[PDB]
Amino acid sequence: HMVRKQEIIKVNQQLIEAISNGDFESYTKMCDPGMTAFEPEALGNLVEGLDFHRFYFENLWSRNSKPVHNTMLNPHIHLMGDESACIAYIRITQYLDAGGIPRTAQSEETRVWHRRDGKWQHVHMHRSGA
Amino acid sequence: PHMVRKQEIIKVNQQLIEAISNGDFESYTKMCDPGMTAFEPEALGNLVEGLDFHRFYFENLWSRNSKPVHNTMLNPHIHLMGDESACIAYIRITQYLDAGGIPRTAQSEETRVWHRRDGKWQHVHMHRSGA
Amino acid sequence: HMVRKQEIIKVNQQLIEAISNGDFESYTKMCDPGMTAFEPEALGNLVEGLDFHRFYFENLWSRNSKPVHNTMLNPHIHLMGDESACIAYIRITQYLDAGGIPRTAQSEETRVWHRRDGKWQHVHMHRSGA
Amino acid sequence: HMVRKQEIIKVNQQLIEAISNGDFESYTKMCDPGMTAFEPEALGNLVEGLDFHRFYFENLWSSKPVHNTMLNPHIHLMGDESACIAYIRITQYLDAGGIPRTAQSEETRVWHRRDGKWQHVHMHRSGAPS
Amino acid sequence: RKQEIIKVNQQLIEAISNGDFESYTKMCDPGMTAFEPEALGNLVEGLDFHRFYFENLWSRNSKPVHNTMLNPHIHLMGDESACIAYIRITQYLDAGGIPRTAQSEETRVWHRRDGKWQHVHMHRSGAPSV
Amino acid sequence: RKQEIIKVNQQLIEAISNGDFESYTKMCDPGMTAFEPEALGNLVEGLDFHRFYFENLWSRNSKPVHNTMLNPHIHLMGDESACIAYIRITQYLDAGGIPRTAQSEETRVWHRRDGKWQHVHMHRSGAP
Amino acid sequence: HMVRKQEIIKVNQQLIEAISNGDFESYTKMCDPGMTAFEPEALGNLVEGLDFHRFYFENLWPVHNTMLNPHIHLMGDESACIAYIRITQYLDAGGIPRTAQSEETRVWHRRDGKWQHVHMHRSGA
Amino acid sequence: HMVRKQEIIKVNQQLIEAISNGDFESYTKMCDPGMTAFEPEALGNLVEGLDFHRFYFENLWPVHNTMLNPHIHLMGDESACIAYIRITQYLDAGGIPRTAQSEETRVWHRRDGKWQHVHMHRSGA
Amino acid sequence: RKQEIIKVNQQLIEAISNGDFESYTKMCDPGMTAFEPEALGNLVEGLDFHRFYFENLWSRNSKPVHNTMLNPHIHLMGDESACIAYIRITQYLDAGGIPRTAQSEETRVWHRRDGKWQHVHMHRSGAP
Amino acid sequence: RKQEIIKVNQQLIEAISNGDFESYTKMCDPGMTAFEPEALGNLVEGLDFHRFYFENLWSRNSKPVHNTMLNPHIHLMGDESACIAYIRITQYLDAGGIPRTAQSEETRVWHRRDGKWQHVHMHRSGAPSV
Amino acid sequence: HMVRKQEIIKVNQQLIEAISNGDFESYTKMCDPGMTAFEPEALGNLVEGLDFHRFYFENLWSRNSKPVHNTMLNPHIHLMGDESACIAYIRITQYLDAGGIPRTAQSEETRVWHRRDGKWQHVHMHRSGA
Amino acid sequence: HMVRKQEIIKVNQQLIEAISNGDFESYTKMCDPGMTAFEPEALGNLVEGLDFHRFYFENLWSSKPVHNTMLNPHIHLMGDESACIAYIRITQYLDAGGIPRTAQSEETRVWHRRDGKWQHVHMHRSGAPS
Amino acid sequence: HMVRKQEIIKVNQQLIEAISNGDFESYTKMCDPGMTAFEPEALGNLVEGLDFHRFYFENLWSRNSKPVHNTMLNPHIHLMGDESACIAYIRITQYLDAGGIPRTAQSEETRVWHRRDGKWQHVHMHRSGA
Amino acid sequence: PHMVRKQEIIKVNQQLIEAISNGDFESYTKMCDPGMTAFEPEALGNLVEGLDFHRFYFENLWSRNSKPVHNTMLNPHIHLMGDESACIAYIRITQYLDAGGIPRTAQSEETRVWHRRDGKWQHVHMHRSGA
Ligand SMILES: [K+]
Ligand SMILES: [K+]
Ligand SMILES: [K+]
Ligand SMILES: [K+]
Ligand SMILES: [K+]
Ligand SMILES: [K+]
Ligand SMILES: [K+]
Ligand SMILES: [K+]
Ligand SMILES: [K+]
Ligand SMILES: [K+]
C-alpha cells in the first residue's frame, strides 16, 4: 500500500514542479487530454482540456526570472483499486512579489489520477483558495 | 456498460446530497467510507478526516424539515477510472429561504470521489469551494 | 408582419402578467418544458426547465398580493419564418417596498418563442439587470 | 438537425473569432443589418445595427492575446431556419500590467437562415464590459 | 395664449398633488411619453405607468403638498402646440412630519386637439417622486 | 414625416460634437431655451451659454466620438411643430484610449419656419 | 441717524416674532404682496415669499431668536436695508437645545406710511 | 416701471464686469465706502466689502458671467434692490469648463446723482 | 490673592452645572460677553443666551456631575481685574450610567466692583 | 480708550502676519499665556512657543495675508487692563496659490505696565495657524 | 517510539476535553502549577500559573448549555528523551453562536509536556489564531 | 532592601485591590493628599488630588467580577524612603453581554515613605480607560 | 524646596534638550545604565537600559538638523527626601513635517530621578501620547 | 547546574536569532534538527517541517547587511525538562528601518524548543505569533 501511495506522491510532486517552472510540456505529458478542473481563476466553472492552463503557462508562469517553492503539506492519498488514486493536500506557494518581497499563498488541492497504459494520468483537479 | 455506471454514480450522489439536506446522518454514514476526507469552506482550508466533523452539522443544523431547500446539480462531469472508481464534478445551486424569508441562491463547486467496495459505492473524498 | 408581431407581443405580455400575478399555472402553459434561462438569480449559470423557477413563484410572487406592475418598453421583434420569434425589450417593474413606497426596477429581457402545434411556446430567456 | 446544430456552432465560433481579431468585415458578413443587441457597454439599452459595434472594432479590438472559450453551448432549433445558442464565455486576457486575468459573460445569440446563409439577428450579453 | 398653457399645466400638477387620476387622464393624451427619474432613464409611453403612482401613493395620501411653478417659459409653435419649461418646487412632509422641499426641472409639451389642450410629452430631471 | 425630424436632429447632434457652432446657430431659433446638467438646474435662454462650451471643449477636444439616438419617439403636432425624445448614447475615448459610453435622455422641440426646422427648446438629463 | 435706524430694528423685530410664533396674518400685513426671497428652503431660487411661506406657517409653525450686530443702511424716507446674523435656539424634538445661525438681509419699503417687507435674503441654515 | 428698472440692470452689469476682469478702481468708484457684504468667502460674517475684496482683486483676479431672471424692486428716487441667480462659466486650471451658481442680492443708492453699491448678499458658491 | 479668584470662579462653575441661574446672574456683569461653541463662533452679549441653556438643560438634566479646574493660571492686573485660564474637566454620567469625561479650555475675565468680583467675559473652546 | 486697545491689537496681528518677532516680543509680556489650536488644548506660557512659528514660517513667508478684526468688543476694567474679543478673518493663499479664508475667535487681555500696553493672555478658537 | 507519541496524543486529547467541557479540575490536574502560556486573549504577554485561564472556565466555558467539538488535526509530536515531549497541531473548534448557527474556528497550538513523578504535566503552551 | 521591595509589592497590591473593590476609604488611606496622576480617563491631563478619582469610585467601581493581575513588576529603590514600581496590568472582566474580555495597561506608581508608612504620590497609566 | 525643585526642572530640561538635538552622549550621562521605560514605541513593554533607545537617536533624531522645540508645561515635582524626585508634565514637541509645515505633538511624561554620587540620574520614565 | 543550563539555552537561542538576522543559513542548519517544525505567520497557520520553508527566506530576503536591525529578547522564561530538553518563551521586539527609512518597531511572541543531542543543543520546534 504505502509504496503505491509514495508512487502517487512522486508523480504529483513532478506535476507541481512543472507548474513552478512553467514546463507545459511535462505538464501535458502527465495530464489526460480530457481532464477537468475546478479552479478559482475559472470563476466557478468546470474547465475541460488543457487550454485554460496553457494561457497561464505562456504568460505568468513562464516569467521564470522569479523563484518559486511549492510545498505539499500532509498529502492524504486514497487508493481505489490498482488503477485509481486521489490525493488531497494543502499547497503552499512561496514566491516574490513586484519589488522582490517574499510572500506565501495557500491553496487546497484535490487531484485525481488514473493509470492508463501503465502510466499515471491526471484526470481531474479541484483547487480552492486565491 | 459505462453509460449505466455514470447513472449509478449520479443517483448515489443525488442520494448523498438529500441525506445531507434532510440531516439523515444514518444514510450519510451508510454511503460514506469511514475514512473519507473533505475539503470544505467550513473547515477553514483544512482537510478533515472521517465523519466526525460533519456529525456536528447534522446534530445542530440539519433537520428533515427545518426549512425548504432546493439543491440543483448542474451538468455533472463523471470520470470513470476502471471498474470500481468514479469521480464526479458539478456546480451546485442552492435555493434557500434566508432569515427574512427572502428566496436567495448560492453556488458551490463540488468534487466527490466514489469507490465501489463489495458491490456498493462508497464516498471517499469531497472537495467543495464557494458558498 | 405587423399582425404577427402583435401576436408575439400579446403572449409575451401574458407571460409577464403571470409573473407579476404569480400565476405559475399559466406561466407553465406558455413555456416549453425544456426552456433554458440566463438570469441574475442563477449566478451566471444556464438553468433548464421550469424547475429552477418554481422556487421563486411558490415562495415569493404568490406572497401577500401587494401591487406589481410590469411594462414592456418599445419591444423589438425578430420574425424567423412563421414558427419562430425573438422579442427584446426593457422591462420596467413597479413595486412597493417594505414600507409602502412605490419603486421601479429595470431589466433587459430577451425571450425566444417557438410555434409548436398551434400554440406559441417560450423556449429561451435571457435577463440582465435587477 | 444534428448537422444544423453543428452549423450553428461553427458560425457562432467564427463570429466570436471575428470580434476577438477585430475583423469587422467578417462580423458584418455574418450579421443581419437590422440586428439588435443587449450588452453591458450599451448601459442597459437595446442598440440596433452594427454602427454601435463599429466604434469598438476600429478603436479597440483591431493589441494583446485574448482567449475566448465557449462553455457548454445549448442550442434550441426552431424549425429549419431559426436557432438560438446560449453559453457561458470565459475570456482570458492580459490587463494593463500584463498579468493574466479571466472574465465571465453569459451570451445568447439568435440566428436566422437567410438565402441559404445563417444571419445573426440578435445577441444578449450579461457580465463585464470590454 | 401663454396664460392658457400655464393654466392647464397648473391643473395637471394640482391633479398630480391631489391624486386626481380622472382629471389627469382627461388632460393627457393616452399616447403621451415621459422622461422621469422614476423611469430610471427610460422613455415611458401611456398612462398606466403613472396610474401605479396614483393608485398606490397620491390617491393614497391627502397629506399636504404645495407645488410652485417658477418663471415658466413657453414656446408657442403655431396655433395648436406649445412647450412650457419651468422649475418645479415641491413642498411636502417627510416621514417624521418635517417640512421638506424638492426641486425638479420640467418640460411639458401640449397639443391642442379639438379645442382642448392635451399633454403629449413630459421631461423631468431631478428628485424622484418627491 | 418623422424621418425628416430624425435627420435634422442628428445633424444638430453632429454639429455639437464637431464643435461646429456655425451649423448649430443655423438650426437653432435664437430664442431657444435649454435645461441641461451643466446649467445646474436653471433654464438658459439663447445661444450664448452653449458658445462657451463650443469654444473651450467640443472644438478643443476633437477626438473619435460617436453619438447614437436610440429608438426616437416623435410627436407631430400639426405640420409645423415636433417633439422628439430619445436615449442618447455617446461613444468616446477617455484620456488613455479606453473606449467609454455615456447615456443621457434628451427632449428636443422643433418648429418649422419658412420650410426649415428650427430648434426652440431642449431638455437633457443624465451625464454632464 | 440712530433714531430712524432704531425704527427699522423695531419693525424687523415684529416680523421675526410673527414668524417665530406661527402668526401668518401679521406677516401678511407687514409683507408687500410682491415680496421676493432667497433662502435655503427655496433651493437657490427667487420665490414670492407669501405663497411660499404659508406652507411653513400651516405646518412647521420654546424658541429664542436673537439678532446679532444689526447693520442698517438708510436710503431716503422710503427704504432701508438691514443685515444681521440671526441666532436661533430651539428644542430638537429630542429635548436637547441646539443653536442654528443664519445670515439675513431684509429690505423694507414705506409706501403709504407703513413699513412693508420687500425683499429678504437668508443663507447659512 | 420698466424704464428705471433697466438702468439698475445696467449699473449692476458694470459692477460685475469691473469684478469679472479684476479692475478695482471702477469697483471702488461704484461702491459706497461703507458697503457691507454677506458672501461665502466671509464665512457667515458681515464685512466691509472694499477692505475685504481688495485681497481678491490683488490675487484671485476666459470667464463668462450671466445674470438670470433679474428681479428689481424700485424704492423711490434714491434706492433699488435687484436680486438674481448668477451663473459663472470658467476654466478650472485643468482646461475643463465648469459652471458655478450663486444667488445675489444687491442694494443700490443714488446719493449725489450717481448710483453707488450699498449692500450685497451672495450665497451658493 | 489668586485663591480668591479661584474660589469665585469655582462657584460660577458650580452654579452652571447646578442650573442655578440666580447665583449665575449675581456673579456676572449684565454686559458680559462670551465666546463658546454653542454660539457657533459668534460673540454673545448679556445673560439671555445662557438662560435658554439653564432652563432646558443644566436644570432639566440634573445628575451626578463633577467639574475640575486643572492648574489655573491667574493674571493679576492691578487690584481690580483678573484673568484666569484653565483646563476644565467635566466628569458626568451618560445615558446608561457609564462615567464619561469631557475637556474644554476656558478663559474667564473678572472685574472687582464694590468689593465683589464680577464676571465680564468668558471664552471656551473644545467640547460643546 | 477703546481705540487704543484696537490700535495695539492691530499692531500685534500685523506683527504676526509680517513675521515681525521683534515687535511681537516688544508688545507681549514674557510671562503671557495662550490657548491656541496648535497647542492641542494646552495652556502655553512664554514667547518661545510662538518663536518657533515665527522663525520657521511667518518670518519665512512674505506671501500675502490680510487679517480683518470684526466688531471688536472691549471690556475696560479700571485704567490699566483691558480685554478685547473679536472674530478674526484671515485671507491667504494655499499651496496652489488659491485665495482662502479662515475664521477664528480671539480673546486678548492687555495690561498697561509703565504706560505701554502689554499682552498677557490670548485665547483662540478655530483653525490652526492658518 | 510510536507508542510513546500516542501517549502524548492521549493526554493532550484529555486536556482539550476539559477545555471543551469546562472541567477546570481535570485541567489543573494535568497542568504543572508553574506553566506558562502565550495566548491571543493575553494580548501578547506571557502568563504564568492557571489564574488567567480559571476566569475563562468560570464564565465563557462553563456555559455548557452549548455543544462544542475540538478536533486536533495532524498532531506532530517531538520526543526529547524519555521525560519530555512537544506536540504541535492545528485545532479546529466547532461551536454554536448566539442564535444557534454552527461555526468553526482555527487555532495553531504548541503544547510542551514533562513527566514529573511518573505523570505527564503540561508546562508551556503557545496558541495563535483568534 | 529585599524586605523593602516586598513592602512596595504588597502595598501596591493593596492599592490595586482597593480600586478593584471600589474601596475609596483604603485608597485614600494609602495615597498622599497631593498625589498626581496621568491616566487615560483624564484625556491627557495631569490631575491632582483624590477628587478626580472619587467620581469613579462612587459611580462605578463600588458590579461584576474583575481579575486585575500584575505582570513582571520592576521596582527601583531610591534610598530608604522612595520607590518606583512599574508593571504591565492585565484586566479580566465581563462586558455588557457577559462575555469575558481582557485589557492591558502599563502602570508606573511612585511611593514615598512618610512617618513610617508608604504613601502613593504619583501614578501614570497608559492603555484603555475603564 | 523651591531651589531643589528648580534643580530637577533644569536637569530634566537638559535631558529633553539632548533628545531634540539628538546628543546621545549627554542623554547617556544623565541616565542610569539600568533605567526602565514605558513608551508607545515599545508597544506596551517595559524596556531596560539605553539599549532600546540607541536605535531611535542614532537612526532619527540625529537626522538632517531640522528644527525641533520641546516645552515642559507646568511641571509637577514630588521631592522624596534629598536624593529622589519624580517630575510629571505635558510635553509639547514642535517640529516640521516633510513639507515644512510647523506641527505640534503632545505627550504625557513621568520621569523619576535618583541622586547618585552627587549627580542626578534618570532611573525610570513613562511616556504616553504621540 | 540548572542556572548554568538556562544561560546555555539563552546563548544558543541568541545565536540562532542572529543567524536569522544575518541570513547565515549555514549556522541556522548547524543549530536546527533536520526535522524541526515551525508555526509562524508566514506559513499561514500551517505547521511546516524541515528547513525547506525557511531556506526560501534566507535566499531571497536575509543578507548579512541588507539593513540595520535590532532584535531584543524580553524577559525569557525557560523550562528545563530533565537533562537534555529545554523550552524558552519570550517576547521579541524588532527595531527595523521601513521603506521610507523611518525607525519602526514590531512585537512577536516566540516559543523555541531545544533538545540536546550528542552534547549539542538542537532546535526542534518553534512557534511565533504576532508580527
Ligand atoms: K459506510
Ligand atoms: K450580412
Ligand atoms: K385625454
Ligand atoms: K437659426
Ligand atoms: K439656451
Ligand atoms: K451681577
Ligand atoms: K454672554
Ligand atoms: K514686552
Ligand atoms: K493618606
Ligand atoms: K543540525
Q: What method did the depositors use to determine the structure?
A: X-ray
Instruction: Return d(Cα C105, Cα C40) in angstroms, integer.
Output: 13
Rounded distance between C-alpha atoms, residue B109 and residue B37, angstroms: 16
User: CB-based contact (8 Å) between G76 and chain H?
Assistant: yes
Residues sharing a CB contact under 8 Å with residue J108, sequence separation 6 or more, in sequence order: J9, J12, J83, J84, J85, J119, J121, J122, J123
Say if residue E102 is exposed, middle or buried (CB neighbours under 10 Å; 0-12, 13-18, 19+): middle
Cα-based angle A64, A68, A74 (whole degrees, multiple of 5): 145
Per the structure block, which three cell numbers stand in for H121?
A: 448678499
User: What is the rounded CA–CA span in Å between residue A105 and residue A127?
Assistant: 13
How far is residue J67's CA from residue J69's CA, in Å, rounded to a whole number? 7
- Give the span between the Cα atoms of B116 and M93, in whole angstroms: 77
Give the nearest chain F residue to D48 (CA atoms).
F70
Find how far residue K101's CA is from the centre of its chain: 25
As a three-state string, the secondary structure of M51-70 is HHHHHHHHHHHCCCCCCCEE
- Are H121 and G123 within 8 A, CB to CB? yes
Q: Do D55 and F91 touch (CB under 8 A)?
A: yes
**Contact state of N103 with M51 under an 8 Å Cβ cutoff:** no
* N98-to-A98, M20, N41 alpha-carbon distances in Å: 17, 22, 19
Quote the CA–CA distance of E18 and E65 in Å, as a whole number: 9
Ligand 9 centre distance from Cα of residue L11 (Å): 13
Torsion from C-alpha of B72, B76, B78, B84, nearest 10 degrees: 10
Q: How far is CA J34 from CA I8, I107, J8, J41, M105, in A?
A: 22, 10, 18, 10, 16
Q: L3: which residues sit within 8 A by CB, 6+ positions away? A: none
Residue F13, φ and ψ in degrees, nearest 5: -70, -40
Q: Kindly state the greatest CA–CA separation across chain G.
A: 47
∠ CA A112-A77-B17, nearest 5°, is 65
> Under a CB-based contact definition with an 8 Å cutoff, are residues B73 and B18 in contact?
no
Amino acid identity of residue K100, one-letter, is G
Q: What 3-state DSSP class applies to N24?
A: coil
Which bound ligand lies closest to the C-alpha atom of F31?
5
Q: How far apart are CA A61 and CA M38, in angstroms?
A: 49
Facing residue for N37 by CB, picked from K76, K81, K126 = K76
CATH architecture assignment, domain B1-131: Roll (3.10)
How close B86 gets to chain C, by Cα (Å)?
25
**DSSP string of chain D?**
-HHHHHHHHHHHHHHHHHHHHT-HHHHHHHEEEEEEEE-GGGTS-EEESSHHHHHHIIIII-----EEEEEEEEEEE-SSSEEEEEEEEEEEEE-TTS-EEEEEEEEEEEEEEETTEEEEEEEEEEE---
Ligand 4 centroid vs F30 CA: distance in angstroms? 6
What is the C-alpha to C-alpha distance for residues C123 and C114, in angstroms, rounded to an integer? 6
Q: Which helix (H) or strand (E) holds G123?
A: strand G115-123
Closest CA to F98 of D59, D37, N52: D59
Phi-psi region of C121 (alpha: psi -120 to 50; beta: other; left: phi over 0): beta
- What is the dotted CATH code of the domain comprising I1-128? 3.10.450.50
User: Which residue's C-alpha cell is 469575558?
Assistant: L100
Q: Is residue M14 helix, strand or coil?
A: helix
Report the topology of domain G1-125: Nuclear Transport Factor 2; Chain: A, (3.10.450)
Distance CA A82, CA B85 (A): 10
CA I86 – CA I73 distance, rounded (Å): 6
CA-derived radius of gyration, chain G = 15
K86 at interface of L, judged by CB pairs closer than 8 A: no
Distance (Å) of CA C66 to CA C101, C104, C107, H76 = 12, 14, 20, 63
Q: How far apart (Å, rounded) are the C-alpha atoms in residues E5 and A51? A: 68
Buried b (16+ CB within 10 A) or exposed e, E11-45: bbbebbbbbbbeebeebbbeebbbbbbbbbbbbbb
Q: Do L122 and L32 touch, CB atoms closer than 8 A?
A: no
**For domain J1-130, is the CATH number 3.10.450.50?**
yes
Q: How would DSSP label each residue in E4-69?
A: HHHHHHHHHHHHHHHT-HHHHHHHEEEEEEEE-GGGTS-EEESSHHHHHHIIIIITT-----EEEE
For residues K87 and N39, give the distance between their C-alpha atoms in angstroms, rounded to a whole number: 12
CB contact under 8 Å between D102 and A56, yes or no, is no
Resolution of the experimentally solved model in angstroms: 2.1
Are M42 and N105 in contact (CB < 8 Å)?
A: yes
**How far, in Å, from the CA of B33 to the mean position of ligand 1?**
5
Hey, how many other C-beta atoms are within 10 angstroms of the C-beta on I119?
A: 19
Q: Which of residues 3-22 of J touch I (CB under 8 A)?
A: none
Q: How far apart are CA D36 and CA D120, in angstroms?
A: 9
- Residue at grid coordinates 424549425: D79
Q: Where are the domains of chain I?
A: 1-128
* Cβ-based contacts of C44 with chain D (< 8 Å): 88, 104, 106, 127
**Distance between start and end Cα atoms, chain J:** 30
- For K126, the closest of N37, N111, N124 (CB atoms) is N111
N54 and A102 Cβ atoms separated by less than 8 Å: no
Q: Is B75 exposed, middle or buried, given 0-12, 13-18 or 19+ CB atoms closer than 10 A?
A: middle
Provide the Cα torsion K14, K19, K24, K27; round to 10°. 40
Q: Where are the beta strands (DSSP E) in chain J?
A: 28-35, 43-45, 66-76, 81-93, 99-113, 116-126
Dist. CA E124–CA E104, nearest whole Å: 7
Tell me the sheet residues that pair with G107: G81, G119
Ligand with minimal distance to N36 CA: 10
- Tell whether D46 is within 8 A of chain F (Cβ): yes
Residue F4 and residue F84: Cα distance in Å, rounded? 11
Question: Helix (H, G, I), strand (E, B), or coil: what is residue I68?
Answer: strand
Q: Which chain I residues are within 8 Å of J120, Cβ to Cβ?
A: 75, 77, 83
Q: Which of K14, K26, K1, K34 is nearest to K125 (CA)?
A: K34
G23, three cell numbers: 402668526
Query: Which-ligand-closest: CA of F119?
Result: 4
**Please, which residues bridge with residue K85 across strands?**
K79, K113
Q: Which residue of A has its CA nearest to D102?
A: A41
Is the Cβ–Cβ distance between D83 and D54 less than 8 Å? no
Do residues N88 and N78 make contact, with C-beta atoms less than 8 angstroms apart?
Answer: yes
Report the 10 Å Cβ neighbour count for I30. 11
Asked whether the beta carbons of residue A101 and residue N46 sit closer than 8 angstroms, the reply is: no
Question: Sign (positive/negative) of CA torsion D7, D10, D13, D17?
Answer: negative
Half-sphere exposure at residue M105, Cβ-oriented, CA atoms within 13 angstroms: 14
Question: Rounded to whole angstroms, what are the CA distances from L71 to J13, J35, L88, L130?
Answer: 54, 40, 5, 19
How many angstroms separate the CA of residue I98 from the nearest CA in chain J? 24
